[PDB]
Amino acid sequence: TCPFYKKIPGTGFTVDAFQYGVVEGCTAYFLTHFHSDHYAGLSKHFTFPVYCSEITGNLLKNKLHVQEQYIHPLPLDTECIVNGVKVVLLDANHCPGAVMILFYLPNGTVILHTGDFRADPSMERSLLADQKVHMLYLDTTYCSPEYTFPSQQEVIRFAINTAFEAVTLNPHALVVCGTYSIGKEKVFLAIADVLGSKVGMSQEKYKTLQCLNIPEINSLITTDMCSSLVHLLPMMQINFKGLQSHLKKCGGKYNQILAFRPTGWTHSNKFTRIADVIPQTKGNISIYGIPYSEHSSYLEMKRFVQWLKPQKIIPTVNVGTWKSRSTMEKYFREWKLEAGY
Ligand code: NI
């Protein structure tokens, strides 16, 4: 059965609720982004209206084979009417095609569902600026002050400089980047750009990337691995065994691997600055864990909420334990008392 924090009161709507069978009273199913915890349950056999971004709708049609007649893509930053209710989709600064959803309820209540997001001050000047929000359904992934990480721009600087140095010292080094979902494409695109290479990958992952409206993409990616010195592999293969095996396959073109695992937060964040990050090394293989996040840090989250001043907050992440729920509720009250709303 569908949990309460996936239902929008006063509407026939649910958000990211495809794994519960037919939800009683649901006339339209919204999908915030194409990540498997959120789309779980969709397929070519789904026959209700799905509302989403253009990019999410390209992925539904080409990767999950959802029939076109049930996909309802909406433009961003545009007031639209759905089953008699005004909605707006906003950029969530998560993965490609990810949105927040503003619902303007018939009774005057305004609700923001962030989906998954990385809060940013740029959001304080979208259509959110113009009106009050009564209820916020909040991505609370990293809702504790221990969760600090650098900007995406500092992390990419590190990666470009690390890759460029290594391959200039050794022109026979290969760079490998791990992936398991959409998101974090800047990591591998920025490294390939500095090296003057295309990114090489499987047909399945190439297909996924061709659904994302990224400009000049035919210029940056390829299925011809032999022509590329930046390769993408599944995240599970980014270990010494899996990389040794890959190097065998390249037929003596390369004699060294430098590999990147973009993670979210890890506890080495609570000690080490990005500048000071070092790899794990075995022989001619080095692996860098880099803290490239597509979710809000604690401070980014707190700033957004203190700017928005919602009347009620409903967490959508970490909701399964009483200790997590109590922790989150204590921070929400702090923020409200400090800011005065
Ligand atoms: Ni996500």
Curated annotation (Swiss-Prot):
GO terms for biological process: cell division; double-strand break repair via nonhomologous end joining; interstrand cross-link repair. Expressed in brain, heart, kidney, liver, pancreas, placenta and skeletal muscle. It is found in: Nucleus. GO terms for cellular component: fibrillar center; nucleoplasm. Induction: During mitosis. The mRNA encoding this protein contains an internal ribosome entry site (IRES) in its 5'-UTR. This 5'-UTR generally suppresses translation while specifically promoting expression during mitosis, when cap-dependent translation may be impaired. Its main location: nucleus. GO terms for molecular function: 5'-3' DNA exonuclease activity; beta-lactamase activity; damaged DNA binding; zinc ion binding. Signal peptide: none annotated. Keywords: Cell cycle, Cell division, DNA damage, DNA repair, Hydrolase, Isopeptide bond, Metal-binding, Mitosis, Nucleus, Phosphoprotein, Ubl conjugation, Zinc, Zinc-finger. The keyword Protein transport does not apply. Belongs to the DNA repair metallo-beta-lactamase (DRMBL) family. May be required for DNA interstrand cross-link repair. Also required for checkpoint mediated cell cycle arrest in early prophase in response to mitotic spindle poisons. Possesses beta-lactamase activity, catalyzing the hydrolysis of penicillin G and nitrocefin. Exhibits no activity towards other beta-lactam antibiotic classes including cephalosporins (cefotaxime) and carbapenems (imipenem). Binds constitutively to TP53BP1. Binds CDC27, which is itself a component of the anaphase promoting complex (APC). Binds PIAS1. This is DNA cross-link repair 1A protein. The lineage of its organism: Eukaryota, Metazoa, Chordata, Craniata, Vertebrata. The chain holds residues 700 to 1040 of 1040 of the full protein.
